[PDB]
Amino acid sequence: GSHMRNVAAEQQLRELESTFDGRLGFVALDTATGARIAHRADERFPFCSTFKTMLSAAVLARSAGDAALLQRRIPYAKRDLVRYSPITEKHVGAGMTVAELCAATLQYSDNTAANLLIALLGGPQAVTAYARSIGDATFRLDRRETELNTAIPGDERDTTTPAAMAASVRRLLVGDALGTAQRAQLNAWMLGNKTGDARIRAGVPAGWRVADKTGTGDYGTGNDIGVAYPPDRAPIVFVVYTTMRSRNAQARDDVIASAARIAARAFV
Ligand SMILES: CC(C)(O/N=C(/C(=O)NCB(O)O)c1csc(N)n1)C(=O)O
């Protein structure tokens, strides 16, 4: 790694953004030194499902002082299901444990699981309050699934910046936001993600294991956040937010993977 390479990488990100009609928000952090590669680091983007990492962390933090919270089973009916409930739709009735709901929302992006957990914590503002408690003054959760993914720009609801989210992801997965057992559990879940094969994972070498959470929304919004763990050097934090100008736009997995690849190559 070198300063020269990082500056060149930021230029490559500018060039990558020029290839599509949208915005690229990007922060990668090499935790060996805190070196950063960024683009639009301080602009707000809709986080979409990437908030499920902050949500699950809040649940884990509560569980640290709330005996057997993770084992509590929350019942729900078929009429309670939100659009896109690939795991929870199989357990209607008695429901699933809090731990199982965290796993479902992180690994499959299950929306009913997310809403059940948001409600358990006392509403969206409890997730925001948790973010504040780990030093994130930027993150805000205002709505539930699936409304938080939608456009009804100037709307700041359900947004964060790439820089704020990178710091929070670093603190949660590598640093000192959670207790050691809780940090290990969050990593364990996110390393098992099933929805990110075409995003950050597609931009890093085959030996780097990636704990990530994706997000997708209106205006072709395509996001992925997480940490890559090389076997032989310090973890690297990746935050990629993309959103398009056209409401009809598709998300761009290829752009997300290319952005990650730019930083992975520059750092190592
Ligand atoms: C598939 C993919 C990308 O998308 N997930 C959703 C969904 O609502 N995601 C909210 B979030 O991932 O931003 C979804 C709604 S209908 C459907 N199929 N998927 C995901 O699970 O990650």
Author numbering: 22 to 173, 184 to 248, 250 to 262, 264 to 301
Task: Tell me, in the authors' exact words, what the paper reports.
CBA consists of two parts: a glycylboronate moiety that mimicks a transition state intermediate of acylation and a C7β side chain that mimicks the bulky C7β-aminothiazol carboxypropyloxyimino-amide side chain present in ceftazidime. The binding of CBA reduced the unmapped region by two residues, Ala171 and Ile172, in PenL-tTR10. More importantly, the α-helix of the omega loop was restored, consequently reestablishing the catalytic interactions among Glu166, Asn170, and the catalytic water W1. By contrast, the glycylboronate moiety of CBA exhibited a similar binding pattern in both PenL-tTRs, which mimicked the acylation transition state of β-lactam substrates and was similar to the bound conformation to other class A β-lactamases, such as TEM-1, CTX-M-9, and CTX-M-16634. In PenL-tTR10-CBA, the O12 of CBA was hydrogen-bonded to the Nδ2 of Asn132 and to W5, which was relocated to a position closer to Asn170. In addition, the thiazole ring of CBA had a ring-stacking interaction with the hydroxyphenyl ring of Tyr105. Although PenL-tTR10 and PenL-tTR11 exhibited differences from each other in their enzyme-ligand interaction patterns, their binding patterns were largely analogous to those in SHV-1 and CTX-M-9, respectively. It is of note that the B factors for CBA in PenL-tTR10-CBA (18.7 Å2) and PenL-tTR11-CBA (42.6 Å2) were higher than those in SHV-1 (16.1 Å2) and CTX-M-9 (10.9 Å2), respectively, suggesting more flexible active sites in the PenL-tTRs. Consistent with the structural data, the CD spectra of PenL-tTR10-CBA and PenL-tTR11-CBA showed that much of the altered profiles of the mutant enzymes were recovered upon CBA binding in the far-UV region (190~200 nm), reflecting induced-fit reformation of the active site. This recovery of the CD spectrum was more distinct with PenL-tTR10-CBA, which showed a highly-similar profile to that of PenL-WT. While PenL-tTR10 reconstituted the original conformation, PenL-tTR11 appeared to exploit the flexibility of the omega loop, allowing large conformational changes in the active site structure.
